[PDB]
Every structure is written in structure tokens, then in C-alpha cells.
Design a protein around this ligand. Sequence first.
Ligand SMILES: O=c1oc2cc(O)c(O)cc2c2cc(O)c(O)cc12
Ligand SMILES: [Zn+2]
Length: 350
Amino acid sequence: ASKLRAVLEKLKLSRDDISTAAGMVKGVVDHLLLRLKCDSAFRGVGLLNTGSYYEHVKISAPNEFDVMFKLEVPRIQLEEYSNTRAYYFVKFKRNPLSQFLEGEILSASKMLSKFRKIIKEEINDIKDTDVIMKRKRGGSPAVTLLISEKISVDITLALESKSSWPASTQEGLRIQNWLSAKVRKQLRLKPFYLVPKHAFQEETWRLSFSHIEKEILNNHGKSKTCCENKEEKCCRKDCLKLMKYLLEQLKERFKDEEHLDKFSSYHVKTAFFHVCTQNPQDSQWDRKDLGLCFDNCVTYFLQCLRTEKLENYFIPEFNLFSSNLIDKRSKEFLTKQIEYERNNEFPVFD
Ligand SMILES: O=c1oc2cc(O)c(O)cc2c2cc(O)c(O)cc12
Ligand SMILES: [Zn+2]
């Protein structure tokens, strides 16, 4: 459809002017890292080795950045919480970060408090940089920095574990018929991350594989040279852009009906990875079949909404569409709206 290409062109024109705000983001992040190194608890803090200071959770908000700070720690031991498959208490192999211990458990609350305090005091020194209260997110992102009242950056703290991935990830990352089993082995040799998120609960941590997700998106083809020359231009990243934008537009349209609050771009990204697994051939993502491919993604996301099943791509026992996480009527609301847009040629794209 031409409307899809027009939407993509709008998104690219919106993206070209960032190369100036990205420098500001890099400066502020570098400053806060050099500050956090001075603390006795955060000596090994840094940015995820993702080749970018930042990511973008929202494609329709080029002003909202998302950075993640990793903290290399002594050998970590993990305990599962209530068979959640994703949430864990952290212990230390043996006796630095000792100040944040609450018994045998590493306190997420205490560490986040010191993190935020260090932020507040080091941002009072900067210029046009205000800290705001976004603790309604359940510890992650930890902070939400504000520059010139037009730049918003969410900062999430993450613990790096160079151990083997937890057992819940054993049947995840099913990229064997798509990106090969060698690549899956290589990726699972990389470390994993733990972010402070609660379940009621007040001291749990959740698994994070944003680096692996970024690696997959930027190396997404069966052919190693996908999207490296003009003869192999597939439309996977364009379909993902279309899915993110559809969700963002629907969430902005119905921001006053609290039925689309708990949906995020992580859901469409998870579904999209599953569709990639289902459609492993690059020929199934020809740049000429953009409409058909996007329609495959939309219909698969609808299937996940109706059946209330959206497995985490790395932890398949974690149902992101769990009745414990999102109510059935909210899923049904999103299903109706997506069916409406699909039956009416997506009026949100006009
Ligand atoms: O790493 C993320 O993991 C998740 C896991 C979940 O189960 C979930 O429901 C949401 C997320 C999620 C949502 C975001 O907006 C984001 O920027 C990152 C993540
Ligand atoms: Zn490609």
C-alpha cells in the first residue's frame, strides 16, 4: 500500500534531525556515568555495548530516548520468585556492593534509592536538566531525565551476569531455522541482564535481553548479506516500524480509555520475532510484498490477543498476555480496534 510507504517516509523525515539531539544525550549520559563512577557502589557502571548510547521505545516520539546502564558485578546467584520464570532474587557467590544487601538478597529498592539520589545531586549541577517522578513504572526505568522541556530520557539500571542464561530461557530464542543454530549458541554465550521490577512484591529483578534483540534486528536475515546490497532488500524492519506505529497511534487515540495502557512496543516486538521464526525465509519478506507481510504481522498479533498468549521470546513460559498482567477486556478492546483498522485500511495512518 502507498499509505504504508507514506507513513514510513514521514517517520524517516522525523528521524533525520535527531543527529543533533543524540549528541546532547551522549553528553548527558557520559557526564552521569563519570559521576556514578565516583560512588563506592557503582564503580563498574557503563552503557550497554549496543553500539548506541540510546534506543527508542516509541517511534512516533523522536524526543523520548531510552538508555540503559549496566553494572558489572561479582558472580551472581539467582533464586526464582513464585515460579514466575522471569523474576528473581539476587544473591552473591561470596562477599563491594555489600552496602545494598538486605540479608542474602540484594535490595532493588535500596540500590534504586542511592541511584536516584546520586542523579538528583549531579543533575542539580547541569543546565536545563530536571529529574521527574516516574516511579509508577515499578523500578524500571529508574529515572526520567528532562532537558530543555523537549528531551525526555528514561534511564534503567541493569545488572550484568556473565553466567549461563537461566533455565527458563532454555526453550526460548527459537532462531534455529531462521538465524541458524550456530548463531543461537553464539548469542546464548553472551551475558544477560537483570533490571529491578516488582511483581505486590518489593525486591525482585527481571531478565533482560535488549542487546540480543538489537543484535537480531540489525542482523535479521537468513542471508548474511540481507539489507547489505540493493538486491536483498527485505521489509522486516519496515514491518516492525509499522507495528510499533500502529500501537503508538492507537494508544494515543484512546489514551483516555485505560484499556490500552499496559500494551507497549515490547509486545509487538515479541510478536514480530515470533513471526520471523514462523516465516524464516527472506523471500517471505520481499520488499515488494510489504502490504502482505505487514498483514501477516497484524493477523499474528491478533491471534495472540484473542488466545491471550504472547510468550516472551526468550522465556516461553512467561505469558506477556497473562490474565495476571493484562485483563481480558483490555485484550478484547485492542482486538476490536486492530480489527477495525484492518477492515478500514488503517485510518490512523492518514
Ligand atoms: O525489556 C523489556 O521487557 C519487558 C518484559 C515484559 O514482560 C513486559 O510486559 C514489558 C517489557 C518491556 C517494556 C518496555 O516498554 C521496554 O522498553 C522494555 C521491556
Ligand atoms: Zn533484510
